[PDB]
Automatic annotation (TrEMBL), chain A:
It comes from Mycolicibacterium smegmatis (strain ATCC 700084 / mc(2)155) (Mycobacterium smegmatis). It comes from the Bacteria. This is Virulence factor Mce family protein.
From TrEMBL, chain D:
It comes from the Bacteria. Keywords: ATP-binding, Nucleotide-binding, Transport. SUPFAM superfamilies: P-loop containing nucleoside triphosphate hydrolases (SSF52540). This is ABC transporter, ATP-binding protein. It comes from Mycolicibacterium smegmatis (strain ATCC 700084 / mc(2)155). Residues 4-240 form the ABC transporter domain. Gene3D superfamilies: P-loop containing nucleotide triphosphate hydrolases. GO terms for molecular function: ATP binding; ATP hydrolysis activity.
Automatic annotation (TrEMBL), chain E:
It comes from Mycolicibacterium smegmatis (strain ATCC 700084 / mc(2)155). This is MCE-family protein MCE1c. The chain crosses the membrane at residues 12-37. Coiled coil: none annotated. The lineage of its organism: Bacteria, Bacillati, Actinomycetota, Actinomycetes, Mycobacteriales. It comes from the Bacteria. The chain holds residues 1 to 53 of 524 of the full protein. The gene is mce1C.
TrEMBL record, chain F:
One of its GO terms (cellular component) is ATP-binding cassette (ABC) transporter complex. This is Conserved hypothetical integral membrane protein Yrbe1a. The keyword Nucleotidyltransferase does not apply. The gene is yrbE1A. It comes from Mycolicibacterium smegmatis (strain ATCC 700084 / mc(2)155) (Mycobacterium smegmatis). It comes from the Bacteria. Pfam families: MlaE. GO terms for molecular function: phospholipid transporter activity. The chain crosses the membrane at residues 7-25, 46-69, 142-168, 188-208, 228-249. The keyword Membrane applies.
Amino acid sequence: CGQWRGIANVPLPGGPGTESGSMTLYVQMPETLALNANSRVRVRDVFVGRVRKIELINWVPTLTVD
Amino acid sequence: RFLDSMGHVAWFVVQAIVHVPHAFRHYRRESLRLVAEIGMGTGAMAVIGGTVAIIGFVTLSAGSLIAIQGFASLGNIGVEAFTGFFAALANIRVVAPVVTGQALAATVGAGATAELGAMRISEEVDALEVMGIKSISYLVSTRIMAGAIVIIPLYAMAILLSFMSAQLVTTIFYSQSVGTYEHYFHTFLRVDDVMWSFLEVIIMSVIVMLNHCYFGYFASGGAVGVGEAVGRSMRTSLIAIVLVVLLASLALYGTDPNFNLTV
Amino acid sequence: GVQIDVTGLSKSFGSSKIWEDVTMSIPAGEVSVLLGPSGTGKSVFLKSLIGLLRPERGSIVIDGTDILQCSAKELYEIRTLFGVLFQDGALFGSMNIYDNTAFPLREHTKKSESEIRKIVMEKLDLVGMPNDGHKFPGEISGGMRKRAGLARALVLDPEIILCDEPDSGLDPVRTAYLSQLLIDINAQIDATVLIVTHNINIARTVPDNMGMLFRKQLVMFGPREVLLTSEEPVVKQFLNGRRIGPIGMSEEKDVPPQLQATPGMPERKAVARRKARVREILHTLPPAAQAAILEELD
Amino acid sequence: GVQIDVTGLSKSFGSSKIWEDVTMSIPAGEVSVLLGPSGTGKSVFLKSLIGLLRPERGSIVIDGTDILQCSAKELYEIRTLFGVLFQDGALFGSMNIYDNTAFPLREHTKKSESEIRKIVMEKLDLVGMPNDGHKFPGEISGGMRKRAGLARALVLDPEIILCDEPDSGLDPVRTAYLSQLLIDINAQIDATVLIVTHNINIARTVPDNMGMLFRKQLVMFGPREVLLTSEEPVVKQFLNGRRIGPIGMSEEKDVPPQLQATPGMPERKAVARRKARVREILHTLPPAAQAAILEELDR
Amino acid sequence: MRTLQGSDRFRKGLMGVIVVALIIGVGSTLTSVPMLFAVPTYYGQFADTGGLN
Amino acid sequence: GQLEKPLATVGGFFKMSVMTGKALFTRPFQWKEFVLQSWFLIRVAFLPTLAVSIPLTVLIIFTLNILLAEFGAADVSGAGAALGAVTQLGPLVTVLVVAGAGSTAICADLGARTVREEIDALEVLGIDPIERLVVPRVVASTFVAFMLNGAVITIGLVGGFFFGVYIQNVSAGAYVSTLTLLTGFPEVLISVVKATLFGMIAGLVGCYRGLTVAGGSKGVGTAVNETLVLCVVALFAVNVVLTTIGVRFGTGR
Amino acid sequence: MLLTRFIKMQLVIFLTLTLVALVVLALFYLRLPTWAGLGMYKLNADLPNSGG
Amino acid sequence: PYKLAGLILGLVGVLVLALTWMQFRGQFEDKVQLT
């Protein structure tokens, strides 16, 4: 309720990064260019993960990536 | 109970299907009368055109909706010359079969349910059984044959009027050029889709006629129960029509979408 | 006309039973009437005798074949002897009186159009509808519908005729007209007519045999003279329309000279056969009943 | 019991006419019966008497107020005088027999639930349903439905009662029971009972006045003694259920002692008034009818 | 009912269909009506519309 | 004279609706009957509503996804997924499963009351049927249509998401982030207006046909069939008009 | 049997509507002669690449 | 023979659904896998 950022910014079930054994990383981006949550993490252009949260900590955006 | 009801409806549909040759040979004049009654309506609804007028109005409305919303959205985006391409695939794939099915269900199926319920209450089915006549063969099989004969012209008119309404709305009210609309319509429309849609509509009409004849044939409770039978038959018909269209579209285009734009 | 031998019949819709252990012997060619208080399931009995409904137990023998236990192929030939008049005629509104009448002749007989027209016009003349063959069932009154249904039932030369509440929707005068018509029909074609009704004028004027249903049982069945002199409280109360007797206010709380055929019609062989059977039965009746029946027969 | 004055009443469903010029004066408190051949539109007349239907001509002057020329607001009080028994009772299936009976008491009066229970139990016991309050209309039979409709009609102290085909779906024994109940009710409350039926047993024991409709007309209306000794072909044919007479095979081809109130019931005041009117009527009757009625009255 | 089957259905139908047609017409052009939404209209001279609608 | 025959029934319906509105805004409301009719319509038209909405939205999503995947723009599918579901699929499934089930049930119930002379029983008791029967049924029809439209839109969107993601292998983030691209407050508002009007008109037509049943032996069935046909035609016409009005406002423009 | 000549009228008007609708749909909307190949001759071509 | 026909109807429905699902996934036509 208080942290409601939209239907586009809520974590969604399924897909890569949601299965057991997935690793959680934090990426301190200088800026996000209006990137939404549930976007695709790509290694070698292959969709292999998902960004969970894009909370902004102390004016620098931080991304939680599965 | 549940298995017993499924078995009763299965017995009814099997008995109705196996008596189609018997009805075709023995009862031809009755089949022609039912064809006329289904095509041109009955009662107070026959004076306005019957099933043809209702089907035409509903399909014109559906085509107008497609053209209206389609052109609005594409003009907002900017790529509005694709409307003729968007309308056709809207009509054939999803809109026209389902909409024609619901209108056919309402008119023809509710009329059949009401007629068979009135015959059941008025002891006319008992009169037929006393006179040594297969009631199912005389009534339900004749209805099925009449529906099979009448569905193809009805769906042809439905498709024609849906296409006409979409084209008229796009090229008259929205003032799009007729050449661009006709090009994008005739270029991205495949006759194979129309043939498969006709097959879907034929199967759906047979199922709808069977369901409504079942609900009207075993009616009970006097004149009051006929209306409840009509309502239940309508609910079942809606569900069956939507399910049939979904399954057919899933089977046909699951692997090959049958549509090419890019390289 | 042919005889119907009912034995141990019983109907039941679930837990509720309609009538239990009905035993009859409807004689050949004679008019018989089944009576009872309202809500005794007489129409269910009428339907059961032709096979529309299936009694749980019992037997309904016609000729020598129990029509209750026979294949539907044989049932469609058994029902050729029958002719049924329903409470409203059970006509089909799609076709006129002529086509409704000719329908049995077009389904079974391999006759021509001229022969069918002749017999249909004859049977429409028999029931007082000579020039009403072009009208539709929705354009005629209830009595005319009954006449048309009877005419349809007469085309195939029936042996047994069933009548479901001939008094429904008819005042006593038109009911008297229809009763005279039934007597005339039995005089002419000599068909086993069976009627279900609770009317008392019909019960005391028309039939040769009468039976009584009360409290889901058969009280008694027998000839006209046996029941009209009966000292059974239920039969006497019902036939006299009294208010004092076993019959209550609702279902929960539970000799007349007879009608003669129109002059010019052939003699009713049913009357003589009924009189002979009454003479045979006479020695098993109370002395007052025997004396009354002897006075009637003399 | 109040008097109903009908003058020049006519009806027409489309180009056809149901009946024409029905002019009668229904007495006050006297049981009356309107009969005729089937299809003469007697239930139409019965419903027009209260205002369910609107006759094309005439007037129905109940009290001094012509209810045909009356506003809808006023008809909320005229119909308080009425109690209507329909053919099947016209009960409400969503509520039980107790609530069906108490329904007009809750709709019109302001009485507490104790008085409501008292009145409803009294009237249910009156019509032979003392312990059947909890049942629903679907559970009960046609006779019990008629009794429940009557009980619902007897709670607001009606001054007119309209019975629509009380013999429908009933054998002669149950019809006799219901006729005795109606006679008892008129003995107790002296309401103007009017019955529409083509039954002949009813039309020879129950009524004080009788009238007959034949061929879209009213052939005659009059007391029991006048009608049962009338040498009119149509009336004499119908009251005996004969076959030779003007009435045809179908619509297209066109004294008894009387029922007495049960012993222990208050004396019927309609009998004395009926005889008092019959003498003044007999002043002008044919000599054979005069002799027959004089013999009947002097028994 | 008496009121439903009364001999006033023709005028009621005329009035009702006129009201429904008026409602549909006003609802369609409620934004474009000049009486309720009037603003001054200015003009400009251009060499070409340039695809302007 | 040819037009004068249906015009009489049209005038009867319009006068009955005017009296219904007057009784709603003037006479005391019947809360009990409104609750009973609301629950009746819910129990008679909820499961069919889902059973028609789920396969239909699955079919629409499948067609849209395959056509866009061939087009190349498979990330904007959710846009269309929203755009139909809010403004057409919701109200049209409401039209179908309200006219077929609830309107026909109301017509059958009032016809049963009429043929059993319960309407005349009310009328001779001084009571007015239009206030005691029609008003709660119309209000219940409107309420149930509103709720069912909301449920249909939600279930359609969720089912489209699940089908597209778990079957056609589209990206979930593209589905949820493009839903609001073409759908906003005007679309949900016009959907709400459509549902309310559809429910009100269906209730009015059902009540009017039920009160004027012809009895007989086929009168109730004929009345129910005519109710269904009239409801389908009228709701389709009103949907066309309201769709034109709604696209006049637009989220994209 | 039957042949009331009003059912016959409905049948003939329905058949006329059927033929008109079928011919119009087949010619002016579906272009069945084009799909089947009526009034057209076959021609081939060899390409280094499809080009989409 | 109601209970027999109910089973037959259910089996027909299940087989139709299964065949539609198999045709949707292209199980019938055969293809070769390359890496």
